[PDB]
Amino acid sequence: SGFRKMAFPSGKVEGCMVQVTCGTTTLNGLWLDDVVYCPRHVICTSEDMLNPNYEDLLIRKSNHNFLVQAGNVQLRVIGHSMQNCVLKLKVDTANPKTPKYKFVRIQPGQTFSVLACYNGSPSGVYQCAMRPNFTIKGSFLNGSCGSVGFNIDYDCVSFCYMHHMELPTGVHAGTDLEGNFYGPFVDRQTAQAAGTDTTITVNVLAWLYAAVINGDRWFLNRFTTTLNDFNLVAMKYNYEPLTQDHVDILGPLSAQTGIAVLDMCASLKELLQNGMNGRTILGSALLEDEFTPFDVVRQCSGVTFQ
Amino acid sequence: SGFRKMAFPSGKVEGCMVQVTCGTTTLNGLWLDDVVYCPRHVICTSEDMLNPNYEDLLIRKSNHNFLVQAGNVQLRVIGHSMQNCVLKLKVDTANPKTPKYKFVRIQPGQTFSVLACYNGSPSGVYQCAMRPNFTIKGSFLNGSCGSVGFNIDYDCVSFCYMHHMELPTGVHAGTDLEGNFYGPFVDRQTAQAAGTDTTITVNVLAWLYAAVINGDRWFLNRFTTTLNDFNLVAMKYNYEPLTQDHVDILGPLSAQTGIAVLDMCASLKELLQNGMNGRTILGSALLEDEFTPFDVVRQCSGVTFQ
Ligand SMILES: CC(C)(C)[C@H](NC(=O)C1(F)CC1)C(=O)N1CC2(C[C@H]1C(=O)N[C@H](C#N)C[C@@H]1CCNC1=O)SCCS2
Numbered sequence: 001s002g003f004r005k006m007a008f009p010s011g012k013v014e015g016c017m018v019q020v021t022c023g024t025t026t027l028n029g030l031w032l033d034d035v036v037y038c039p040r041h042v043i044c045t046s047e048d049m050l051n052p053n054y055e056d057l058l059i060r061k062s063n064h065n066f067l068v069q070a071g072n073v074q075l076r077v078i079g080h081s082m083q084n085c086v087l088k089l090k091v092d093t094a095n096p097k098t099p100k101y102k103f104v105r106i107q108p109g110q111t112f113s114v115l116a117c118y119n120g121s122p123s124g125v126y127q128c129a130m131r132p133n134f135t136i137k138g139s140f141l142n143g144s145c146g147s148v149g150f151n152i153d154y155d156c157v158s159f160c161y162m163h164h165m166e167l168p169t170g171v172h173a174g175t176d177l178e179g180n181f182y183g184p185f186v187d188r189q190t191a192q193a194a195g196t197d198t199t200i201t202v203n204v205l206a207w208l209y210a211a212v213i214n215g216d217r218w219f220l221n222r223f224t225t226t227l228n229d230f231n232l233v234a235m236k237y238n239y240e241p242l243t244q245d246h247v248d249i250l251g252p253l254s255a256q257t258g259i260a261v262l263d264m265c266a267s268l269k270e271l272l273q274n275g276m277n278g279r280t281i282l283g284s285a286l287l288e289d290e291f292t293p294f295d296v297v298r299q300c301s302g303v304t305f306q
Numbered sequence: 307s308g309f310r311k312m313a314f315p316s317g318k319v320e321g322c323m324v325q326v327t328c329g330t331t332t333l334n335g336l337w338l339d340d341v342v343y344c345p346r347h348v349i350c351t352s353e354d355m356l357n358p359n360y361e362d363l364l365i366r367k368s369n370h371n372f373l374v375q376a377g378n379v380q381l382r383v384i385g386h387s388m389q390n391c392v393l394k395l396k397v398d399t400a401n402p403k404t405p406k407y408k409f410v411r412i413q414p415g416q417t418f419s420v421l422a423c424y425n426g427s428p429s430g431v432y433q434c435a436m437r438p439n440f441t442i443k444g445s446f447l448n449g450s451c452g453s454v455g456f457n458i459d460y461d462c463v464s465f466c467y468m469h470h471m472e473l474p475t476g477v478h479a480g481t482d483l484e485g486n487f488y489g490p491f492v493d494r495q496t497a498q499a500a501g502t503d504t505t506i507t508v509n510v511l512a513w514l515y516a517a518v519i520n521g522d523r524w525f526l527n528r529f530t531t532t533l534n535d536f537n538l539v540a541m542k543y544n545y546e547p548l549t550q551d552h553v554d555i556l557g558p559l560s561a562q563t564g565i566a567v568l569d570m571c572a573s574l575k576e577l578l579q580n581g582m583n584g585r586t587i588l589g590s591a592l593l594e595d596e597f598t599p600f601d602v603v604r605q606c607s608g609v610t611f612q
């Protein structure tokens with residue numbers, strides 16, 4: 001029993017983290033086989049933050065200008081190139097700790113763990129969601145860029161995020177591992193702001209299922225709803241529309257608890273319209289939306305990784 | 307910016323996790339040098355859960371009866387003994403991934419990360435506190451016992467917890483790595499219940515400091531309080547007494563923000579007496595008490611580990 005914001009074990013990613021330095025600027029890189037991936041704004045100067053000419057800045061760098069360290073060991077750079085907003089530094093040594101891996105582009109509403117790093121060393125690990133507005137609510141300071149987000153499946157690490165930017169109100173933006181930003185953001189110091197965020201309805205439902213599995217059942221009412229009538233209420237409270245695919249993805253939790261998804265929607269409808277009246281669910285006073293249906297099953301069934 | 311429930315990187319502990327099986331029962335063990343540590347109730351039978359005769363059960367086991375697997379590799383057991391509530395299985399192979407480590411007994415109110423494991427493989431990592439009533443609010447299923455809690459300092463893993471029991475209401479009890487339980491609990495299936503818990507006042511204050519550091523300042527009032535008058539209010543709301551040592555431990559955060567601890571106590575006093583009126587702090591609708599002052603500094607200053 002119990003339900004926690006749970007991150008993936010980070011060891012496989014820890015073995016890939018390195019430090020990349022250009023002049024005064026150090027950030028993190030991801031070392032897979034003989035390539036180090038890092039944000040291209042490592043090549044930025046104190047002056048041209050507002051609109052860096054990245055191609056001109058990279059033209060003027062040589063391999064030797066990139067100082068890459070794995071622990072206390074310098075990795076010699078033998079090639080460099082830029083792919084969208086990431087640099088790829090070819091090094092002369094393949095990373096012997098390289099896990100089985102994939103580069104994936106996740107969808108809004110999906111979750112992943114972040115291994116927050118500084119100077120190529122890990123600070124901590126936490127779970128995040130890709131918000132509907134393509135930000136993440138992370139915890140990042142100066143020097144954290146190049147920290148990555150990831151999922152694990154059996155033995156395979158799917159890298160999905162690399163950290164680049166902090167936006168107004170303290171939320172975060174970054175790229176996939178092909179260097180393409182999530183959302184409309186750019187790697188320059190210019191007026192950007194996130195679009196308004198919305199609540200990830202399918203995740204709130206999954207978390208209500210987790211509550212029922214843990215014996216926290218007070219909010220279940222005796223009613224049902226149609227999918228259309230629920231979505232009319234979701235809309236007023238800034239919740240994402242619930243789709244049939246969402247309903248089908250909730251199948252396993254619905255089957256385990258014996259609660260039809262649309263019956264759970266009726267209970268969520270009542271919570272939205274009426275509030276929680278000072279009560280908590282799974283120890284929370286707000287409805288939580290950063291657990292996917294898959295996260296709930298993994299945590300409540302004890303799925304492991306090798 | 308940002309503030310997350312952040313766990314330690316788990317890689318150093320992942321390299322120590324093994325599976326221990328006696329007959330039908332499998333749980334996790336911790337492999338350090340040539341010793342595997344695990345809960346002694348691995349030797350329990352389907353029948354004598356209510357009050358196992360552990361000494362008689364262990365007398366009847368031989369080395370070969372303990373099946374210890376590291377990944378897919380059997381570790382041959384060459385010695386066994388019992389220390390309080392843990393078994394120590396000597397194996398013929400020292401763990402080449404053994405980190406620098408210590409066994410520590412933590413105090414109530416301190417925090418640590420749990421690497422939840424099943425069949426010797428990791429499921430996830432999350433941050434916990436040792437509650438004033440010597441329980442932890444974990445997330446554990448059948449087969450999780452032997453999972454450990456830990457802190458890291460530079461390169462040194464301090465193991466502080468090993469999981470043994472789930473208590474009524476879904477909270478958890480366990481031992482230090484010398485096999486001594488935290489709290490009045492015993493490893494048998496008998497009526498035990500936690501004493502009433504209380505809120506960890508020094509941690510709530512630390513988390514209010516983290517809020518100020520992140521620009522979430524609405525709850526700061528213009529008043530101060532004496533330590534005695536604050537503690538009279540803390541008592542009514544089931545908060546731990548705040549001690550001078552707690553005040554001094556909050557020194558670094560107080561100095562960083564320029565807010566005297568007793569001034570923060572006045573603001574906390576107002577929150578306790580008046581509620582939050584539907585507002586949130588650091589995205590939370592309840593006051594959070596599972597971040598220590600040290601956790602706040604580590605997260606907000608980007609402290610890393612090797
Ligand atoms: C005002 C900033 C927060 C400094 C800035 N944001 C914007 O300009 C916006 F348009 C989004 C709002 C921003 O993030 N920048 C500036 C550049 C780099 C990058 C950066 O500092 N990225 C850090 C890495 N390392 C991680 C940041 C630091 C604080 N916490 C984080 O997460 S963009 C390339 C040229 S300099």
Ligand SMILES: CC(C)(C)[C@H](NC(=O)C1(F)CC1)C(=O)N1CC2(C[C@H]1C(=O)N[C@H](C#N)C[C@@H]1CCNC1=O)SCCS2
Binds near residue numbers: 449470497498
């Ligand atoms: C009712 C139980 C939850 C089964 C029981 N609790 C009590 O009897 C209490 F007095 C505390 C309330 C309990 O925890 N037991 C029973 C024994 C083993 C141990 C156990 O199952 N420990 C698991 C490990 N592995 C981890 C548990 C399983 C569920 N979630 C967890 O965290 S004690 C040694 C003889 S059998």
